[PDB]
Amino acid sequence: EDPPACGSIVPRREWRALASECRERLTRPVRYVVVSHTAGSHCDTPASCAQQAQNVQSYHVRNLGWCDVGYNFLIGEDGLVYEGRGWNIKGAHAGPTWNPISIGISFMGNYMNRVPPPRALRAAQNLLACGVALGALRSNYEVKGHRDVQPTLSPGDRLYEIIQTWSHYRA
Amino acid sequence: EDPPACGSIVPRREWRALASECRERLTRPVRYVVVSHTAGSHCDTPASCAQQAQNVQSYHVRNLGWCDVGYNFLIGEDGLVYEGRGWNIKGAHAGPTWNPISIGISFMGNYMNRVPPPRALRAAQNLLACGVALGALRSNYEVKGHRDVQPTLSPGDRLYEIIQTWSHYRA
Amino acid sequence: EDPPACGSIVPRREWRALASECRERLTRPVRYVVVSHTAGSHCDTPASCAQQAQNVQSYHVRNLGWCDVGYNFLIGEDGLVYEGRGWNIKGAHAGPTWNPISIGISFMGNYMNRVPPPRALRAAQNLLACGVALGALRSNYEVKGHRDVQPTLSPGDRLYEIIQTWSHYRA
Amino acid sequence: EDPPACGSIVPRREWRALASECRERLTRPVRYVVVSHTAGSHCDTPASCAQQAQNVQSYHVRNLGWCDVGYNFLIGEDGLVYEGRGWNIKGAHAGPTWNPISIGISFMGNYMNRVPPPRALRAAQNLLACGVALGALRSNYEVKGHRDVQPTLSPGDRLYEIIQTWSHYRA
Ligand SMILES: CCCCCCCCCCC[C@@H](O)CC(=O)N[C@H]1[C@@H](OP(=O)(O)O)O[C@H](CO)[C@@H](O)[C@@H]1OC(=O)C[C@H](O)CCCCCCCCCCC
Ligand SMILES: CCCCCCCCCCCCCCCCCC(=O)O
């Protein structure tokens, strides 16, 4: 017994998460969400999306020396939310101006020339309220595309377009 | 001016469903939630879970003459909640004493010999979070096993064995 | 058992109860009878007692969100009995240990410093005979005060006192 | 280690409690607190209140076969808090729906006509604050009175009135 919710977020264990070593808390109620893409391989079943999830925490951790997988949360084309660092700690996903005062969610794959399936987007907007319900995120929050806060092609052109049409999106 | 949610549900159009013809509604808010299985094939891709969702609906409609898939909400082994008749329409899931006063949710496949995947209980349990949040269910909704209200083994031995734990189970 | 029997209860429809939404059944014959009080106002007329019956249900179903008023029967001081959940359905009046195995009759008044009138008693003793006559209660049924199975002053010092003299009373 | 944090509760041994036999746990952090009153005599000295604590346990354990005194904590009008089942152990003060998910504090007395003193009221707040600094209560915990969740006059008009003015109060 540790989680009885929330937007049916996969807890660290089901995807084989090596224990975070991160120790900088984020300051709930955060004001920003940054959307990004892993520019990684994509996955469409919960068995490709767990393996691919534990693939990026390991690059971040085996190779980059990081305390934990960079993104606050992760999202696959299979269509569920993967717990990363969470609401509480600070992520490493948008450089030093934003990392502290935002939450980062990353879609799992490259989105320059493909978009993700609706469930993927549905899984995200959900984490959204179930995270405002928690008070991690302000009622009135601003959403930003990775490339809006850092010079990168993240989250891909096709995934970018979509998030521009989100009500909480704000350049 | 207070509620804003709730859930990640594969909508009818998304599983390529046939249109309902059903017109009887339930008085909101519903107090019971009866659980069940399909005793059909199971699926672990979203892809073949939109298929099973469909076959289940097909049987129910084309063979039993029904006005829809009989269940308010279904569940796939891809760890997703599949919409059927939804929160407002009456189901054909548990006979004429219980159908009019409850919401019936049914897992897909046959569950005498497989306890179902863990995400699923999260997905389903989270779906009940919605009903409440929407005022589809009573905050104090009561969860019944199918076997509790019909003379049945269903939702499957393994699985039943599970639901007895929930925080809202009276029998 | 061919020609019976009893009948002194005022039916729901007659005191204009709201629809009971309960579905949990007692196994009959029922061994134990639990005597409680409403801890509110007494009534002395069918009219008053029809309302008083009304309020209690309102408190149980309106406020507390229940399926029906708790008791199986309520005794008014106007000398008549009020069909609560009756003989075949689980009361909610003495906790999960006793509700499956008892009917709960509860006097509608406050009996800490008042004796309920002889008619109310007559009514109550008379109601039990009825239950026996029907196989609703075991012929050797055990009566118990509310305070005896639960922490409360129900059914009152002056009343508790009386039912401790009842032929069917048990420590 | 070394931060604070909480106490000023009279422990079990001190008020000479019978050794508890209760197995069943609670899951922290608990969200709900239900305010009850013992509906008995009040005590205003460490001497008598320790007396009370025991009478009440006796009632529940020697007279009802309960594994432990029903409450998690009691408050005396001596201004002290009496350790009951505590933060970690499911108590028996409000039915099988509130018991597993809440914390039942009982004021030792009867506040239908009487009001509690300042130091009783302060002890209780302090005790909830305590619960929070320890992660036994949820920082945004809800307080409910005993007549909000079960049919009863507990915890006394004048005191019900007061707890409704509490910041954590929720009808
Ligand atoms: C450990 C014993 C406590 C001792 C206290 C003494 C006071 C007793 C007064 C009358 C007794 C009555 O409470 C006993 C009872 O029958 N309780 C619950 C239950 O018994 P079952 O035998 O298991 O069917 O049957 C009911 C099911 O029909 C069940 O629900 C009842 O009590 C509950 O705990 C349920 C809650 O009270 C339901 C209301 C809360 C749900 C949310 C709405 C409230 C508003 C708050 C916002 C969320
Ligand atoms: C209101 C019912 C109480 C818990 C049932 C909610 C079902 C799980 C869905 C979670 C979304 C809303 C948050 C619920 C709180 C439980 C989880 C938590 O607080 O960490």
Coordinates of N, CA and C and ligand atoms in Angstrom, one line a residue, chain B residues 139-140 142 170, chain C residues 24 63-67 85 90-100 146 150-152, chain D residues 32 66 91-99 142 144 146 148-152 170-171, ligand 1:
Chain B
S139 N -21.5 8.8 -3.7 CA -20.2 8.8 -3.1 C -19.9 7.5 -2.4
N140 N -21.0 7.0 -1.7 CA -21.1 5.7 -1.0 C -21.6 4.6 -1.8
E142 N -21.9 1.0 -3.7 CA -21.6 -0.3 -3.2 C -21.3 -1.2 -4.3
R170 N -20.1 -4.2 -0.2 CA -21.1 -4.9 0.7 C -21.7 -6.0 -0.1
Chain C
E24 N -30.4 -6.2 0.8 CA -29.7 -7.2 1.6 C -30.7 -8.0 2.5
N63 N -29.9 12.7 4.7 CA -28.6 13.1 5.3 C -27.5 12.0 5.1
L64 N -27.7 10.8 5.7 CA -26.7 9.8 5.8 C -26.5 9.0 4.5
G65 N -27.4 9.2 3.6 CA -27.2 8.6 2.2 C -27.5 7.1 2.1
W66 N -28.4 6.7 3.0 CA -28.7 5.2 3.2 C -29.6 4.7 2.2
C67 N -29.9 3.4 2.2 CA -30.8 2.7 1.3 C -32.3 2.9 1.8
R85 N -37.8 -1.6 7.3 CA -37.4 -2.6 6.3 C -38.1 -3.9 6.4
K90 N -32.1 -6.9 5.8 CA -31.1 -6.5 6.7 C -31.3 -5.0 7.2
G91 N -31.5 -4.8 8.5 CA -31.5 -3.5 9.1 C -30.1 -2.8 9.1
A92 N -30.1 -1.6 9.3 CA -28.8 -1.0 9.6 C -29.0 -0.2 10.9
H93 N -28.8 -1.0 12.0 CA -29.1 -0.5 13.4 C -28.3 -1.1 14.5
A94 N -27.3 -1.9 14.3 CA -26.4 -2.5 15.4 C -25.0 -3.0 14.9
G95 N -24.6 -2.6 13.8 CA -23.2 -2.9 13.3 C -23.2 -4.2 12.5
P96 N -22.0 -4.5 11.9 CA -22.0 -5.5 10.9 C -22.1 -6.9 11.6
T97 N -21.8 -6.9 12.9 CA -21.9 -8.2 13.5 C -23.3 -8.6 13.8
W98 N -24.2 -7.7 14.0 CA -25.6 -8.0 14.4 C -26.7 -7.8 13.4
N99 N -26.5 -6.9 12.5 CA -27.4 -6.6 11.5 C -27.8 -7.8 10.7
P100 N -26.7 -8.6 10.3 CA -27.2 -9.8 9.5 C -28.0 -10.8 10.3
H146 N -30.1 -2.1 22.7 CA -29.0 -1.5 21.8 C -27.7 -1.3 22.5
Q150 N -23.9 -2.4 21.4 CA -23.3 -1.2 20.8 C -23.1 -0.2 22.0
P151 N -22.1 0.6 21.9 CA -21.9 1.7 22.8 C -22.9 2.8 22.4
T152 N -23.9 3.1 23.3 CA -24.9 4.1 23.2 C -25.7 4.0 24.4
Chain D
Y32 N -9.9 11.2 7.3 CA -11.1 11.6 8.0 C -11.0 11.5 9.6
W66 N -15.1 -6.5 22.5 CA -14.3 -5.8 21.6 C -12.8 -6.0 22.0
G91 N -10.4 1.6 14.5 CA -11.2 1.7 15.7 C -12.6 1.3 15.4
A92 N -13.4 1.5 16.4 CA -14.8 1.1 16.3 C -15.7 2.2 17.0
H93 N -15.9 3.2 16.2 CA -16.6 4.4 16.7 C -17.7 4.9 15.7
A94 N -17.5 4.5 14.4 CA -18.5 4.9 13.4 C -18.7 3.9 12.2
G95 N -19.3 2.7 12.4 CA -19.8 1.8 11.4 C -18.7 1.2 10.5
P96 N -19.0 0.2 9.7 CA -17.9 -0.4 8.9 C -17.5 0.4 7.7
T97 N -18.1 1.6 7.4 CA -17.6 2.4 6.3 C -16.7 3.5 6.8
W98 N -16.9 4.1 7.9 CA -16.0 5.1 8.5 C -14.9 4.6 9.3
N99 N -15.1 3.5 10.1 CA -14.0 2.9 10.8 C -12.8 2.7 10.0
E142 N -10.4 15.9 6.7 CA -11.8 16.4 6.9 C -12.2 15.9 8.3
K144 N -15.6 15.4 10.6 CA -17.0 15.2 10.5 C -17.5 14.8 11.9
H146 N -20.3 12.9 14.6 CA -20.8 11.5 14.6 C -22.2 11.4 14.1
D148 N -23.1 13.0 11.5 CA -23.0 13.2 10.1 C -22.9 11.9 9.4
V149 N -22.4 10.9 10.1 CA -22.1 9.6 9.5 C -22.9 8.4 10.0
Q150 N -23.6 8.6 11.2 CA -24.4 7.5 11.8 C -25.5 8.2 12.5
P151 N -26.6 7.4 12.6 CA -27.8 8.0 13.3 C -27.6 8.0 14.8
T152 N -27.5 9.2 15.4 CA -27.2 9.4 16.8 C -27.2 10.9 17.1
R170 N -16.2 19.4 7.5 CA -16.9 19.1 6.3 C -18.2 18.3 6.5
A171 N -19.4 18.9 6.4 CA -20.7 18.3 6.4 C -20.7 17.0 5.5
Ligands
LIG1 C1 -18.4 -0.2 15.2 C2 -19.9 0.2 15.6 C3 -20.0 1.7 15.8 C4 -20.7 2.0 17.1 C5 -21.5 3.4 17.0 C6 -22.8 3.3 17.7 C7 -23.8 4.1 16.9 C8 -24.8 3.1 16.2 C9 -26.1 3.8 15.6 C10 -26.9 2.8 14.8 C11 -26.1 1.6 14.3 C12 -25.7 1.6 12.8 O1 -24.8 2.7 12.6 C13 -25.1 0.3 12.6 C14 -24.9 -0.1 11.1 O2 -25.8 -0.8 10.6 N1 -23.9 0.4 10.4 C15 -23.4 0.2 9.0 C16 -23.8 -1.2 8.3 O3 -24.1 -2.4 9.0 P1 -24.1 -3.8 8.2 O4 -24.6 -4.8 9.2 O5 -22.7 -4.1 7.8 O6 -25.0 -3.9 7.0 O7 -24.8 -1.0 7.2 C17 -24.8 0.2 6.4 C18 -24.9 -0.3 4.9 O8 -26.3 -0.1 4.6 C19 -23.4 0.9 6.7 O9 -23.1 1.8 5.6 C20 -23.6 1.4 8.1 O10 -22.8 2.6 8.6 C21 -21.6 3.2 7.8 O11 -20.5 3.2 8.3 C22 -21.8 3.7 6.4 C23 -21.8 5.2 6.3 O12 -22.4 5.8 7.4 C24 -22.5 5.6 5.1 C25 -22.6 7.2 4.9 C26 -21.2 7.7 4.5 C27 -21.0 7.8 3.0 C28 -20.7 9.2 2.5 C29 -21.8 10.2 2.7 C30 -21.6 11.0 4.0 C31 -21.2 12.5 3.8 C32 -19.6 12.7 3.8 C33 -19.0 13.1 2.5 C34 -18.3 11.9 1.8

